[PDB]
Design a protein around this nucleic acid. Structure first.
Lengths: 177, 63, 356, 95, 96
RNA sequence: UGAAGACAUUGUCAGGUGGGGAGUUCCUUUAGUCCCUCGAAAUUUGAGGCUAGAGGAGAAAAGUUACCACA
RNA sequence: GACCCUGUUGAGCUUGACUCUAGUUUGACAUUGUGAAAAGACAUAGGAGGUGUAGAAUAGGUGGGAGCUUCGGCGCCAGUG
């Protein structure tokens, strides 16, 4: 376990800025004089409180497996990738939101891109390729992805037309079960 | 304390606010297990009927 | 032989033992009446002699048959609502809308739900993937109700391989404080990490340690939970290998490790705690060499801890005396659970308070 | 063995439909995308999520087996016994 | 966040100001409803944190983890208009 | 000279970790004497210890796959 | 189409020395006082106690013990353990 370098912190926040608005709130101090930090453990980035990070130093690095919330992993080529383990963070301050109906929630959880027939609520003035968080009709976050077309251009699209590209779904939890 | 030099007045208010946090905390722990649905309000209507105002942390101060 | 013939003899032998004073035979003693009850119980229910006589000594005749009948029948599936995400009324209503038959598991938990049947897989439902419930066992609910953790404490869970209990402490802690989740197995730890992230837990550290190293590693925990690995005499329905693969050798090494684990849990905790210094020891076994014998050992070699009232509503008092073994009289506070009495797995809960 | 079983008794969606659901979103179809495994297989769990490595090998229902006629050499008899796991196929690690 | 803070506001303001805020939250409850209903139902309270009154941001405070308790002081407020005003809000809540 | 207060702060030993700074080039398996210690139960075990085989230039990156995507 | 290979990428596995130490963290001890109200453990001197099953019955336990007797009840023996 070691903190991030300045190159790695820039890469991690760049990916997060694609999906969220107020990144200052992520690292802002808390009431009890504590704050959230970023940690790297086996090319995996973890979002965790500083107090938890300090008391987790007692665990040997070959014996530590998880810590706080895992945002994702740095790939072999030096590129941060988000994972669905970071979805609760993404939904808290999501910039653009898409809501899928019942007929689109199950296909999304199996790993399919959202189409027009699945959308039940948009977010107006959303550019072409932007990071959006996917919810169902009960405001339950299902995952996140990147939009395929602009909101204005998606309205005139065919029912069987891709409106969002899938990047992570909660069905991946069945994978590592 | 960056005003006047009334440390006695400062201490009087300092101990006053501390007693208020203790009382605010005192009620907080007590009410954490109370149902207050808009239809039925029996528990809140009988929240602390069997308690006197002397037992509260502010009551111990005021006496 | 004829299995239905064995059942008739089993029933015949039990009623004889109930009324041996008036209904008996010419000169055969009740010693070989019980011994006959041993063979036909072994042959019918598929137990070896060592465990069956062990189980028969635990219970009297007509309760014992109810115990052996309960072990063959499966147990109902129960789910635990994640307080970190929702509460029971919507999750019941949400699953009812999808075709799941639900009732509250009972009046003793505001969090558990009981499922009869469903038209969709219960482990793939969208609110499951959202982290709104976890498939757990009703016996697993009990240890965390005995060890109720408050906010802003440090907790130690010494065996969190499935993850149901560790998530429950996080829910009761409202995602505040620190939870040390520990598994000596890397393979099972991956499932715990997945359960933690699915259920939205942020205040946990998953470490892969042997639980006997913990006072050396960190120490100072406010509340420590210990589910010792055991024979599995209360989970016989899910694991039938217990019926024949538990001999005298196994029942000698297992309490030794459990005794070593309990002492580690005692030393791990903090007696001078602002909120609590409680230790809860739990087991999914019914045998006395793994329950109330390890508890007696802890009280006899650590005179700085004391058994306290467990706090669960239902349960049966622990055993004070056994086959020549005299225990500390305070062991009556410990509770037992049986499948035939309560439709929950065989279980045992003990709760300690550290004072020095 | 049969008598023991007799007394004891007296006491999700397919991979193919998942592929149809996924390919519905991805309208453009790449030639040769589906790889139907035409060999007999054993899976086990009713519903599972596969890694993206193997999310393209589809194993049909009709080619699935759960039991086998297993012969005991010493006790000369064979009984239909359920299959728990496949340990090694000495023709292809992928298999 | 504003609904909880506004009940706190109504507690310690002049009679007409308290009445004005009380009427305002009557419209807020009427127009939105289920978005703020869990604030007046203890069973629907969120359990994913603790309420932070003096937060620096609106989202920083966790307002769905608390319950509106101020009705027990405003029901005994000296102004009959305020008491009728409070009863107006619950009547809308009960009709949700 | 006034304020707070027997709590902090601080100091000393024993440890855990240390992808950071400086310097230099322990656990697990196997067979054995039933040889010593520790823990457990009493009419026996488990873990260490000993004998000699096997596993673990160096934070820059490196190796590897009948797998995936693109060329 | 399938087969073999190469390059980039993704998913995964393994390695990435040793000794001190910054940082971080656990336990014990020291400053360091006076009172008062409670709680625990140590000291005696007492009092009262033992109900898992079977056993008629509420068997702390350990040793002798086949005879004791407010002289009629007990014992032993047979059980049950």
């Amino acid at each position: 376990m070691r903190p991030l370098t300045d190159q790695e912190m820039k890469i991690v926040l760049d990916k997060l800025a694609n999906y969220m608005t107020d990144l200052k709130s992520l690292i802002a101090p808390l009431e009890d004089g504590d704050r959230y930090v970023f940690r790297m453990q086996k090319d995996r980035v973890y979002y965790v409180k500083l107090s938890i990070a300090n008391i987790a130093t007692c665990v040997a690095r070959d014996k530590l497996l998880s810590l706080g919330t895992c945002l994702g992993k740095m790939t072999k080529s030096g590129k941060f990738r988000l994972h669905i383990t970071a979805l609760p963070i993404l939904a808290q301050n999501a910039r653009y939101k898409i809501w899928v109906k019942d007929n689109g929630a199950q296909p999304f959880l199996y790993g399919s891109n959202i189409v027009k027939a699945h959308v039940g609520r948009w977010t107006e003035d959303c550019p072409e390729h932007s990071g959006c968080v996917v919810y169902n009709m009960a405001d339950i976050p299902l995952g996140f992805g990147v939009t395929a077309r602009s909101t204005a251009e998606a309205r005139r699209l065919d029912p069987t037309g891709i409106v969002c590209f899938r990047q992570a779904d909660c069905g991946e939890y069945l994978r590592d079960e | 304390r960056k005003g006047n030099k009334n440390a006695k007045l400062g201490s009087s208010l300092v101990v006053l606010v501390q007693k208020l946090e203790m009382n605010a905390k005192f009620i907080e722990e007590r009410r954490a297990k109370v149902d207050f649905a808009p239809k039925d309000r029996a528990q809140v209507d009988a929240f602390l009927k069997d308690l006197e105002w002397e037992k509260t942390p502010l009551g111990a101060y005021v006496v | 032989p004829d299995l239905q013939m064995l059942r008739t003899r089993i029933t015949d032998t039990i009623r004889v033992l109930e009324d041996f004073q008036n209904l008996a035979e010419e000169g055969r003693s009740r010693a070989e009446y019980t011994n006959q009850l041993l063979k036909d119980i072994c042959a019918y229910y598929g137990y070896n002699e060592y465990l069956a006589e062990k189980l028969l000594n635990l219970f009297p005749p007509r309760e014992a048959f109810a115990f052996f009948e309960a072990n063959e029948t499966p147990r109902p599936v129960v789910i635990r609502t994640n307080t970190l995400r929702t509460h029971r009324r919507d999750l019941a209503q949400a699953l009812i809308n999808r075709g799941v038959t639900l009732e509250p598991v009972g009046k003793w938990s505001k969090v558990g739900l009981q499922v009869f049947d469903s038209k969709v897989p219960l482990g793939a439902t969208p609110e499951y993937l959202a982290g709104h419930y976890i498939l757990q066992a009703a016996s697993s609910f009990l240890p965390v109700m005995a060890l109720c953790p408050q906010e802003n404490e440090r907790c130690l869970d010494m065996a969190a391989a499935p993850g149901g209990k560790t998530t429950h402490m996080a829910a009761l802690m409202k995602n505040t404080g620190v939870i040390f989740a520990n598994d000596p197995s890397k393979s099972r730890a991956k499932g715990l990490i997945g359960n933690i992230h699915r259920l939205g837990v942020r205040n946990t550290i998953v470490c892969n340690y042997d639980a006997r190293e913990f006072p050396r590693v960190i120490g100072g925990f406010d509340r420590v939970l210990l589910d010792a690995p055991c024979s599995g005499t209360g989970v016989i329905c899910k694991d039938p290998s217990v019926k024949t693969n538990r001999d005298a050798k196994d029942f000698m090494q297992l309490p030794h490790t459990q005794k070593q684990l309990l002492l580690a849990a005692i030393d791990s905790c903090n007696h001078a705690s602002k909120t609590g210094g409680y230790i809860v020891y739990s087991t999914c076994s019914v045998c006395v060499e793994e329950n109330e014998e390890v508890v007696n050992y802890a009280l006899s070699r650590r005179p700085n801890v004391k058994l306290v009232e467990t706090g669960l509503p239902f349960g049966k008092e622990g055993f004070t005396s056994y086959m020549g073994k005299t225990f500390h009289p305070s062991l009556k506070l410990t509770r037992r659970f049986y499948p035939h009495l309560y439709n929950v797995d065989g279980f045992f809960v003990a709760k300690f308070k550290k004072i020095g | 063995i049969k008598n023991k079983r007799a007394e004891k008794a007296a006491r999700g969606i397919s991979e193919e439909e998942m592929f149809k659901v996924v390919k519905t979103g991805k309208k453009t179809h790449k030639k040769g995308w589906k790889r139907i495994v035409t060999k007999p297989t054993f899976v086990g769990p009713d519903f599972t999520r596969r890694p993206v490595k193997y999310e393209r090998f589809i194993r049909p229902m009709g080619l699935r087996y759960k039991k086998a006629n297993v012969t005991h050499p010493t006790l000369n008899v064979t009984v239909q016994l359920p299959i728990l796991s496949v340990k090694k196929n000495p023709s292809n690690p992928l298999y | 966040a504003f609904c909880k803070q506004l009940m706190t506001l109504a507690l310690q303001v002049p009679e007409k100001s308290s009445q004005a805020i009380l009427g305002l939250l009557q419209d807020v409850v009427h127009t939105h409803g289920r978005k703020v209903a869990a604030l007046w139902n203890t069973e629907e309270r969120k359990g994913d944190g603790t309420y932070k009154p003096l937060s620096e941001t609106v989202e920083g405070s966790n307002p769905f983890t608390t319950t509106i308790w101020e009705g027990e002081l405003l029901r005994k407020h000296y102004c009959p208009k305020v008491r009728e005003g409070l009863k107006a809000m619950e009547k809308e809540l009960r009709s949700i």
